Amino acid sequence: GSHMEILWNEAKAFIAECYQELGKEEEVKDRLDSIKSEIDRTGSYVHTKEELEHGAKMAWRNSNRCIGRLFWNSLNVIDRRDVRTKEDVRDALFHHIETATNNGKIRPSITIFPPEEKGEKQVEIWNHQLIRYAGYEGERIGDPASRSLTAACEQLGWRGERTDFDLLPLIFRMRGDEQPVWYELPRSLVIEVPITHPDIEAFSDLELKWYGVPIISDMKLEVGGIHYNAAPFNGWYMGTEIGARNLADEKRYDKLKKVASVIGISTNYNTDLWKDQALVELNKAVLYSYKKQGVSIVDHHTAASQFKRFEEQEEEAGRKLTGDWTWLIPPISPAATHIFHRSYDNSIVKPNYFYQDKPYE
Amino acid sequence: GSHMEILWNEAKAFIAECYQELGKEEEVKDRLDSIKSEIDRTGSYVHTKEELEHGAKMAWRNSNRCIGRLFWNSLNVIDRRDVRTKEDVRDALFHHIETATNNGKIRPSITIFPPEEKGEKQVEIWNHQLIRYAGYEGERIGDPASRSLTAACEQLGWRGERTDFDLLPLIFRMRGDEQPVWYELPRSLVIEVPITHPDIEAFSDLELKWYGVPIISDMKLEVGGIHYNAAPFNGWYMGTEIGARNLADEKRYDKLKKVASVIGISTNYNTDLWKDQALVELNKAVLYSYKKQGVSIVDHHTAASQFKRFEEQEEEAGRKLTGDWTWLIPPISPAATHIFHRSYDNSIVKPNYFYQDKPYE
Numbered sequence: 229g230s231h232m233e234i235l236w237n238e239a240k241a242f243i244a245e246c247y248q249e250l251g252k253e254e255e256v257k258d259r260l261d262s263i264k265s266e267i268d269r270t271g272s273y274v275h276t277k278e279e280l281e282h283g284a285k286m287a288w289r290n291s292n293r294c295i296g297r298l299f300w301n302s303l304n305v306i307d308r309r310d311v312r313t314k315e316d317v318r319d320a321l322f323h324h325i326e327t328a329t330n331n332g333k334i335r336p337s338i339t340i341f342p343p344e345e346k347g348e349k350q351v352e353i354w355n356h357q358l359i360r361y362a363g364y365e366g367e368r369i370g371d372p373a374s375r376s377l378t379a380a381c382e383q384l385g386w387r388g389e390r391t392d393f394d395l396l397p398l399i400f401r402m403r404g405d406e407q408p409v410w411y412e413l414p415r416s417l418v419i420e421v422p423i424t425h426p427d428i429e430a431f432s433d434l435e436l437k438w439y440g441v442p443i444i445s446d447m448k449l450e451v452g453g454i455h456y457n458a459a460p461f462n463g464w465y466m467g468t469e470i471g472a473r474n475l476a477d478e479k480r481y482d483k484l485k486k487v488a489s490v491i492g493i494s495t496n497y498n499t500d501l502w503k504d505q506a507l508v509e510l511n512k513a514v515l516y517s518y519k520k521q522g523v524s525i526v527d528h529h530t531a532a533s534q535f536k537r538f539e540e541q542e543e544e545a546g547r548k549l550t551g552d553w554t555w556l557i558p559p560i561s562p563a564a565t566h567i568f569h570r571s572y573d574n575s576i577v578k579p580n581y582f583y584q585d586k587p588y589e
Numbered sequence: 590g591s592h593m594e595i596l597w598n599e600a601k602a603f604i605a606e607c608y609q610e611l612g613k614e615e616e617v618k619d620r621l622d623s624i625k626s627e628i629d630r631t632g633s634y635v636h637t638k639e640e641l642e643h644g645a646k647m648a649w650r651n652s653n654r655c656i657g658r659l660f661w662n663s664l665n666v667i668d669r670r671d672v673r674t675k676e677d678v679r680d681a682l683f684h685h686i687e688t689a690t691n692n693g694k695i696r697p698s699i700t701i702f703p704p705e706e707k708g709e710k711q712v713e714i715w716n717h718q719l720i721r722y723a724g725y726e727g728e729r730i731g732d733p734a735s736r737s738l739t740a741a742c743e744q745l746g747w748r749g750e751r752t753d754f755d756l757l758p759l760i761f762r763m764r765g766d767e768q769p770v771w772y773e774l775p776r777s778l779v780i781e782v783p784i785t786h787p788d789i790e791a792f793s794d795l796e797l798k799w800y801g802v803p804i805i806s807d808m809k810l811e812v813g814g815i816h817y818n819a820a821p822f823n824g825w826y827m828g829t830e831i832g833a834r835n836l837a838d839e840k841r842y843d844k845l846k847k848v849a850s851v852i853g854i855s856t857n858y859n860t861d862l863w864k865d866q867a868l869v870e871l872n873k874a875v876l877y878s879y880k881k882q883g884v885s886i887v888d889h890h891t892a893a894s895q896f897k898r899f900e901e902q903e904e905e906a907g908r909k910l911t912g913d914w915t916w917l918i919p920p921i922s923p924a925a926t927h928i929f930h931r932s933y934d935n936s937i938v939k940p941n942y943f944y945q946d947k948p949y950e
């Protein structure tokens with residue numbers, strides 16, 4: 229009924245905009261007629277290799293919360309709409325990790341899995357990120373942010389060693405199955421970086437480490453009415469995501485007091501700004517460590533400078549800029565970046581990546 | 590017409606809410622009848638000493654952009670609705686600086702001047718803050734943020750020494766005068782704090798200083814339909830306002846590179862996070878210097894902790910909390926405070942302080 233109507237309206241808007249940017253404005257008429265016939269025949273339509281490649285790229289370009297958008301057009305799109313089995317999905321996820329890692333020289337990539345047909349999913353990825361650490365709760369072990377997913381993996385037969393850095397398994401559900409399946413990640417495929425400091429030798433005593441590639445696997449890619457619920461993507465890390473959030477937040481690894489102790493400063497007074505000094509050294513340490521191991525990473529000052537060039541290029545291309553200031557500003561020294569000193573329109577423009585309900589909560 | 594209607598509607602809402610908090614719910618009926626008779630007779634109404642005192646307090650409590658709201662009920666309200674001459678306004682502004690400074694032990698205060706009667710102002714303060722530094726532009730001298738006001742003061746006969754820290758004069762306009770008048774601030778009345786560091790001796794070479802009390806003098810206080818366009822207020826500084834903004838912003842004093850040089854670190858690479866380290870030391874220096882001189886100041890961690898207790902007390906009192914996250918989060922280490930990790934409703938609740946158009950721009 230109204231589902232076939234919304235699908236056709238978003239398809240008309242996408243094909244026109246997509247082909248206008250690709251320099252194929254005259255091919256819009258014939259393509260839109262074939263799509264109308266396909267929606268009436270099947271109830272959906274299949275994108276061409278050029279369409280979803282540019283659709284995933286436009287989706288990144290429209291991602292309000294992303295500071296790394298300057299590199300939108302260099303996205304490596306892997307088409308895996310041919311997957312049928314759980315082994316095919318596993319192989320595709322393993323391949324994504326390998327090719328995106330690229331021995332440290334991270335390539336921004338996205339793997340496109342089959343979309344939803346009649347509202348129901350073909351492949352459903354439960355992982356927040358393909359590579360992530362487990363969390364347990366006596367006292368707190370691991371990543372608190374992963375507690376509910378870890379509990380879901382354990383209810384399926386998986387069991388972790390209970391260290392602070394247990395790699396979660398790949399957990400996904402195929403159409404036809406009531407429950408998901410899990411696969412342990414091969415250690416050779418996952419690059420991890422131990423955290424050391426350039427000047428302070430004692431920093432290694434903290435025994436901190438983090439994985440190299442952030443691969444968000446639970447967001448829905450929407451391209452012209454077509455819902456790609458399973459479409460894992462990755463860029464490289466901005467240092468602050470690890471040193472100012474993952475390892476610093478009270479509800480995460482909460483390492484600021486321990487960092488303050490190894491760098492030789494007191495945790496006695498708020499006025500001494502020990503949390504600030506600890507944040508600076510931990511963040512300097514993360515950038516140094518990744519660089520030493522040859523794993524791509526960017527600092528917040530360089531990332532903001534790259535983002536300014538994105539703002540300039542969008543105005544030069546004639547497109548409106550959309551952004552979410554609350555997410556674009558870095559968690560440390562935001563006022564030292566141009567982002568803090570300007571405003572952004574938080575309007576949602578399609579194609580884009582959206583949040584979807586967690587099947588384990 | 591509609592002006593007498595809006596005035597009566599806001600008066601009804603204020604008196605009911607004001608007396609409900611003061612425990613005088615039965616006195617609402619008789620007071621509202623006297624106010625109706627006054628609006629029909631004069632076209633406005635005069636607040637009692639208890640009314641505007643609590644009105645200014647509620648206005649601070651409703652200030653979305655303020656982190657120091659825990660101390661709302663301790664506000665020192667000075668009633669200067671009796672001022673008639675330029676000398677009376679000058680004496681009142683001089684007195685506000687003196688009593689608010691209180692030899693360093695800063696008292697949060699507000700001076701209430703006569704409100705607008707028929708849309709026209711009785712006293713119009715041009716200063717953004719009662720104590721502020723001049724700005725000129727060859728090269729840049731002083732505070733760039735004060736350029737337009739400094740130009741306005743110079744067009745009136747004032748002339749500064751052209752140092753980086755010239756105190757702007759008090760500049761205000763009386764009803765009946767086409768142009769404003771100016772008065773130079775006596776040096777004895779203005780407390781200034783030289784910036785030194787606790788561990789780094791060379792920090793004094795930067796010759797940085799700032800004034801002790803931030804007295805915002807260009808905002809409009811609105812209490813029950815009555816517009817107090819001239820109502821200067823002050824609290825004490827949160828360290829970051831000086832060390833992370835006033836002395837750090839590129840469009841302000843822009844001292845980060847100079848700070849990095851005196852603390853012995855290189856400005857070569859973004860990855861070394863020199864801006865972050867410079868921010869930490871400059872901010873540690875500001876807190877130390879004010880404390881050494883006995884001038885009240887608060888760090889961002891303690892201020893956020895005080896603000897959390899405000900959130901708790903408002904829920905315990907039965908009032909809805911309103912806030913502007915973009916302004917409540919500190920400019921350095923925001924993720925180390927609870928503010929960053931929650932949401933706030935940015936709804937405007939009256940009584941409040943509002944921005945008004947600048948008469949010099």
Ligand code: HEM
Pocket residue numbers: 284287288291293294295296297299303336337338461462463464465466469526531555581
């Ligand atoms: C090239 C390197 C990249 C960098 C430096 C970068 C950086 C960032 C940062 C700092 C955030 C905030 C993360 C957080 O606070 O949790 C973010 C969010 C986001 N990024 Fe990017 N990104 C990159 C690539 C990508 C790619 C390849 C895509 C899409 C194809 C993308 C899509 C998004 C989206 C949708 C969000 C929001 C996620 C959420 O709401 O949780 N990013 N990015």
Ligand code: HEM
Pocket residue numbers: 645648649652654655656657658660664697698699822823824825826827830887892916942
């Ligand atoms: C007791 C100490 C106080 C502290 C620690 C405090 C702190 C702050 C801070 C950090 C800001 C942001 C300033 C900026 O970024 O420019 C602010 C804004 C503000 N404060 Fe407070 N404050 C205090 C007292 C007061 C008082 C006494 C009033 C009112 C009677 C008040 C009214 C406001 C308002 C209206 C704003 C917004 C100003 C604007 O929009 O430019 N504050 N305060």
Ligand SMILES: Nc1nc2c(c(=O)[nH]1)N[C@@H](CNc1ccc(C(=O)N[C@@H](CCC(=O)O)C(=O)O)cc1)CN2
Pocket residue numbers: 551552553554568569570571572573574915916917918920
């Ligand atoms: N303490 C304090 N904080 C501040 C400033 C300050 O002087 N003091 N100055 C500010 C600089 N000016 C603004 C004002 C408003 C907004 C703003 O509103 N921004 C978002 C809102 C985004 C969103 O809702 O997603 C936007 O992009 O439109 C941004 C910068 C920022 N924060």
Ligand SMILES: Nc1nc2c(c(=O)[nH]1)N[C@@H](CNc1ccc(C(=O)N[C@@H](CCC(=O)O)C(=O)O)cc1)CN2
Pocket residue numbers: 554555556557559912913914915929930931932933934935
């Ligand atoms: N990089 C990055 N930035 C972040 C988060 C992140 O994970 N990554 N996590 C965020 C924590 N969660 C939120 C999400 C939205 C809002 C938000 O919307 N806040 C304002 C908006 C205020 C206003 O408009 O004035 C509010 O108070 O309602 C606040 C915190 C904040 N910023």
Ligand SMILES: NC(=[NH2+])NCCC[C@H](N)C(=O)O
Pocket residue numbers: 442444462463464465466469470473474
């Ligand atoms: N740089 C990126 N693409 N980040 C995506 C989100 C990663 C998340 N913030 C993390 O710390 O794991």
Ligand SMILES: NC(=[NH2+])NCCC[C@H](N)C(=O)O
Pocket residue numbers: 803805823824825826827830831834835
């Ligand atoms: N703590 C306060 N009451 N601040 C009011 C604003 C002061 C302004 N931010 C300044 O740096 O001068």
